[PDB]
Amino acid sequence: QCVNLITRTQSYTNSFTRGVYYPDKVFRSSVLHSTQDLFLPFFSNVTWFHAIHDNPVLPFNDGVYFASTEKSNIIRGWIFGTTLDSKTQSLLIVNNATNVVIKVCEFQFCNDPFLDVYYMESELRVYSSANNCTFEYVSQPFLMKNLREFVFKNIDGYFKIYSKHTPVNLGRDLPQGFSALEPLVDLPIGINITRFQTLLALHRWTAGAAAYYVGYLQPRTFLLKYNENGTITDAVDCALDPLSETKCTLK
Amino acid sequence: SFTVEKGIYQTSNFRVQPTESIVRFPNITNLCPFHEVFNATRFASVYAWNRKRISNCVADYSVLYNFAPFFAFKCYGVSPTKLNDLCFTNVYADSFVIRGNEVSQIAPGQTGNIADYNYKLPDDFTGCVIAWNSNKLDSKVSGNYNYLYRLFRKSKLKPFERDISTEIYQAGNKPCNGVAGFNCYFPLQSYGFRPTYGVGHQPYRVVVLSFELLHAPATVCGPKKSTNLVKNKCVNFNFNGLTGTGVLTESNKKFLPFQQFGRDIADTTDAVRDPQTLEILDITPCSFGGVSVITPGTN
């Protein structure tokens, strides 16, 4: 059952204007719109983790920005909750080759949850009990050089997820440019989320590795911009510097 | 005046009248299952209230009057008589049982036992609540103990959030490590409805309906026949509940799959997508302009 075979290392990196999503499902063109919501602040520091085949649990402060570039299909799903114990409720977003499953039950998580597959994926390594729950959900797979970005937040008992794909040449860190994120689902979970983790898949264990970035959202005010075809091509952070504040004031 | 001097004067301007009317609603045939909600044998407790999602159905809101002995709704942001003619994304139904004096706390802004420890509503609630007495069934004899409620909690809840933990709450700086008294209490305390309490102390039944506006494609709304599409003619239309008057035209805007509306500088609808045939159309008002009269003096 529960085993400990993962160690993690941390490095620091800058963001360079990443984490912009569409604020609403309305078409606009050739306009400059001002929105106040939770965003990823420009030029912020993001921890870069390396998981090598112990790892603690990360906090969940008003949303999380998650990005990775691993093409080996080793990262799949996340855990969200407040104590990650069998005494409260917690989310279990899990992905596989054909569908995603989203459940929220009184799970009894292990210290180092992961998935083991042999020759047919198994699940016993994650928890022990799964009672007391009603909310299940299935849909198409979330995950298909390639950078994948996700944004999560919990407001008014609703869980929102955004995503985007971007073919990018290999680099030391995150690229420079703009690429807006589009919504996926707004679930009516209505639970308490304070801490979160990530899930890894191993073959039987055989050696493996993964790399991913983590960033936290904050309440800001942005000044987006739509081109003639309806795509967001630029943005301005109002609370970054006096020049940006002047641009926000003058619209 | 009865006398007009020489000059040019400006009078009322001309508008082009509409010819016919257009209605366009999606392909929905099945009926919403409100009977299994209202006419239910068992009703959940206030701390573990139940939420049921309703989608892809035609909702006849006047049927609910033939389902339970209640007087009227108390609706915020909408009106009870116009539940038809509007299309929503989803409809929810939160249901539980509370005490009579505490019904008034099911509303935005209320504070107390409920709305702080049991069931919180947001400040922008759209929807309303159906409440009625249930003395005959929920108060069989010598009280009841199936219905529980949280008595106290370390912090207030948040809109629509749920707490289900059954722990021991401390009142003194020592750890309880189980129930011991004078510091430790069991937060789930139960009232018991004897069939002799006062009017305010009798049990009640509550059903809350919450609506969200049109951002996703519409799934739930009432019966309405739909006509054909008429274009290049001034006409008044109805697309999933929005009204207006103008000219419908072929469009070339590149709507993304999750978008269904367009907006102008003044935040007025410009483009629209037909619910049945997913094509893009434009809306422009039919022509108008000023009129002037040139005359010499009536003398």
Place this chain on the structure above:
Amino acid sequence: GNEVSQIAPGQTGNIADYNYKLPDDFTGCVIAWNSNKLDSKVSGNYNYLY
């Protein structure tokens, strides 16, 4: 009983559309009281139409 709310300006439904329509600029008082002992009858009172 649950149909008293329909006797008012702007109301729509069954009574306010097929039996008794009030003007939107109505002025006056509307009073309604419960009447059960002298109205309801065992096996159903049937001489009340709508």
Place this chain on the structure above:
Amino acid sequence: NRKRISNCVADYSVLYNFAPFFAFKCYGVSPTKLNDLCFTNVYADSFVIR
């Protein structure tokens, strides 16, 4: 009658446990906010009518 109440801690939440009244009808304040304000003196009247 008219009783003068002063120099004490007023808990307006416990009133619901003494008589079966549905709610309040308050004019210059709201029933939910009576737990925060601080008053000089309070006068309570009582009588019975039809």
Place this chain on the structure above:
Amino acid sequence: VNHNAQALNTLVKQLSSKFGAISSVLNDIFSRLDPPEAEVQIDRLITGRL
């Protein structure tokens, strides 16, 4: 030239305000509210535009 352009643009842009109501579209208010509250919501928009 710029003064007139800016003034007309501001006047056009002002139409998206709510002025304390629930929406800036008259048809939505008409469809979702009965006249007693529709007037109360609409007078705000009329006054603001005036």
